[PDB]
Write a protein that binds this DNA or RNA. Structure first.
Ligand SMILES: [Mg+2]
Ligand SMILES: [Mg+2]
Ligand SMILES: [Mg+2]
Ligand SMILES: [Mg+2]
Ligand SMILES: [Mg+2]
Ligand SMILES: [Mg+2]
Ligand SMILES: [Mg+2]
Ligand SMILES: [Mg+2]
Ligand SMILES: [Mg+2]
Lengths: 144, 43, 174, 124
RNA sequence: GUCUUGGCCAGCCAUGGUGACAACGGGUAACGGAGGGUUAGGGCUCGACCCCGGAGAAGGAGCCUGAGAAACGGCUACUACAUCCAAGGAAGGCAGCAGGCGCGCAAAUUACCCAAUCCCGACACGGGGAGGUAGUGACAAUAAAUACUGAUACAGGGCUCUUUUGGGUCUUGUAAUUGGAAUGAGUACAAUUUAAAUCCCUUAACGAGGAACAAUUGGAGGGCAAGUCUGGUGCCAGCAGCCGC
């Protein structure tokens, strides 16, 4: 309910109150402040390219015991450094030091998904070749 | 205890079995015909 | 100029409902259709008439908007053949079912008129240039035939049936 | 073909402004592919008691499934009227006028641009 | 002064003008709108972009001609960038159409033509990368191939009888058993289309028996349709939007 005004000439109070209280809405606040353009590792884009700096292993969260294979990637467009998960069995062999890879979102809206702590991006393509294509017997990694 | 050197463990350890060649299945309109036959006719 | 175009089907709200999936497969097998899209096509169109018919019933009987629009809707229905002359005015439009709009297809009528002896053969003949309507050859199974046009379906005069000229296979065996 | 070609005429109007007659021609030609523009012209000429040079046709689009074509036919009162009125592209395709041979579009433009750097009789 | 009104400007006089009903200042990854998406009603969000209005032509300023410009495919000057050179000089503005580099997750040919829509000129006659045509093109949208059928043998649901001689031949499937007809994907005389070509459309002689003319993308614990199958690995590899394996 609430003690909202109910006069016939209280539209200004009703609009001002709604504008103030709408900031507490998490999704409106994210859009209104433009945090994707400001603080997101991407510039608000769906994908981004970067250079693989090294291969790191991430221990899975409880209850789960495994080493998730990941790579430290420095984005070309802005220089920010992120960690990208390498999906599928044995796909870490395709990725190597100083490769050019394309990253995408990993799940839902920048939040880490699954038992991988602190990893919020995934590798899509390596050297212009899809990771799934490399993982299957479909395409060949560039000769370089 | 996992490690970066264990990547592709099971993928390399799985024996390769070739797919059995079969007569081609019908496509399009025909494919729906057997599905309808198997579900609401052959009862 | 930005050319107008639209869509003829909608994906269902719930993708994997067991009851909905079975009911659609009833229509696909019975009428020898191709996929689920052209089932969703007929349901979308049928919703359009039903939505339009219901929105006019909310108006006044004497209201001129209902009179003009209502009679316009019935004319297409009667002409197509899904409706009869004794279906006045619109309360009988709401009784229309997806099955009713399906017999009016050229695939069904070519079978209901004995031209073909199986519905899958019926569709194949139409798409393979062996069926004509009046003086016009029609190769689209979705061709909705009116009651006036239902009396003028026969094989093409260029086809081996009706025309008489042997086809490629028959000529080859000579 | 053995079957005769049936001629039809609709939307006929007399247009002395261009000294011609405008109409839409319909062809019924079952069991044959179609009729050429040429043989179409004599049939119109013999139907209207005119000559081949009196008659011109624009575009024949065969109807789906064959057996019928439609198009726009133009017959003139005098041969001089056709030559003065009918566009040059129509004349060259029917055969009684010579094509205006000229260089390529880009080359003519390049030819023109070089002229802008020259003055006086030195251009020619 | 201006085409004209006006603190638009020059002189003289007075102390006013705006603001809590948000003035002033700051941000916009803000050109405005007609409108796009999605919604029972009430709404939310987007709108560089086929139309109307505004502004700009590397960044500012100034100006001539001219009815109309503070014009930039006009000029002048400064800043940045950049071209030729005999080193004295000269010349420049693709956010026009193609094309190149760079940038990025991200976007096409240095093609044909004024034939169609219109515009301009002294003008029926010439010009128009406006514009149309073609090429690349899985942006999105429409229709719609990948197969059709007869019998034989078998099984099931019926029908008169249950002497269970049961197929006897009404129907539907399995026919791993066979015989048939038809056609377009492609191809090509010819005709048609077009400014000229291409394609569609039309159509001679070609073009189908699975090895061919061979449909893929995801999934099978639940949400959510679909495995109590077999082999391998053994909290490893890995899967998993979430619960989880
Ligand atoms: Mg009040
Ligand atoms: Mg801006
Ligand atoms: Mg912008
Ligand atoms: Mg100037
Ligand atoms: Mg350009
Ligand atoms: Mg599976
Ligand atoms: Mg599930
Ligand atoms: Mg279920
Ligand atoms: Mg958990």
């Amino acid at each position: 309910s609430g003690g909202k005004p109910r006069g016939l000439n209280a539209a200004r109070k009703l609009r001002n109150n709604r504008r103030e209280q709408r900031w507490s809405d998490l999704h409106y606040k994210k859009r209104a402040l433009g945090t994707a353009f400001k603080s997101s590792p991407f510039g608000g884009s769906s994908h981004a390219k970067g250079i693989v700096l090294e291969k790191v292993g991430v221990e899975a969260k409880q209850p789960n015991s495994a080493i998730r294979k990941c790579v430290r990637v420095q984005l070309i467009k802005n220089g920010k450094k992120v960690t990208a998960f390498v999906p599928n069995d044995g796909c870490l062999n395709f990725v190597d030091e100083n490769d050019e890879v394309l990253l995408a979102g990993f799940g839902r809206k920048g939040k880490a998904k699954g038992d991988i702590p602190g990893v919020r991006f995934k590798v899509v393509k390596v050297s212009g070749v899809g990771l799934l294509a490399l993982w299957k017997e479909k395409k060949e990694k560039p000769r370089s | 205890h996992g490690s970066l050197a264990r990547a592709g463990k099971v993928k390399s350890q799985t024996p390769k079995v070739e797919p059995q060649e079969k007569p081609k299945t019908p496509k399009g309109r025909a494919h729906k015909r057997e599905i309808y036959t198997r579900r609401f006719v052959n009862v | 100029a930005p050319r107008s175009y639209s869509k003829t089907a909608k994906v269902p709200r719930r993708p994997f409902e067991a009851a909905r999936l079975d009911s659609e497969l009833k229509l696909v097998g019975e009428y020898g259709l191709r996929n689920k899209r052209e089932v969703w096509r007929v349901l979308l169109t049928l919703s359009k008439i039903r939505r339009a018919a219901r929105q006019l019933l909310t108006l006044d009987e004497k209201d001129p908007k209902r009179l003009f629009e209502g009679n316009a809707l019935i004319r297409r229905l009667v002409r197509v053949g899904v409706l009869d002359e004794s279906r006045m005015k619109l309360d009988y439009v709401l009784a229309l079912k997806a099955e009713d709009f399906l017999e009016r297809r050229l695939q069904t009528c070519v079978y209901k008129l004995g031209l073909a002896k199986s519905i899958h053969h019926a569709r194949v003949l139409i798409r393979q240039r062996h069926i004509r309507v009046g003086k016009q050859i029609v190769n689209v199974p979705s061709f909705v035939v009116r009651l006036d046009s239902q009396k003028h379906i026969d094989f093409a005069l260029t086809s081996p049936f009706g025309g008489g000229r042997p086809g490629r296979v028959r000529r080859k065996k000579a | 073909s053995d079957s005769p070609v049936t001629l039809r005429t609709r939307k006929f109007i007399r247009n002395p402004l261009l000294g011609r007659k405008q109409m839409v021609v319909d062809i019924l030609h079952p069991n044959r592919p179609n009729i050429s523009k040429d043989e179409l012209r004599e049939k119109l000429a013999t139907l209207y008691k005119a000559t081949k040079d009196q008659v011109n046709v624009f575009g024949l689009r065969t109807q789906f499934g064959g057996g019928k074509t439609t198009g726009f036919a133009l017959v003139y009162d005098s041969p001089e009227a056709m030559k003065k009125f009918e566009p040059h592209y129509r004349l060259v395709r029917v055969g009684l006028a010579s094509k205006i041979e000229k260089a390529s579009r880009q080359q003519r433009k390049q030819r023109k641009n070089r002229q802008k750097t020259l003055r006086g009789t030195a251009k020619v």
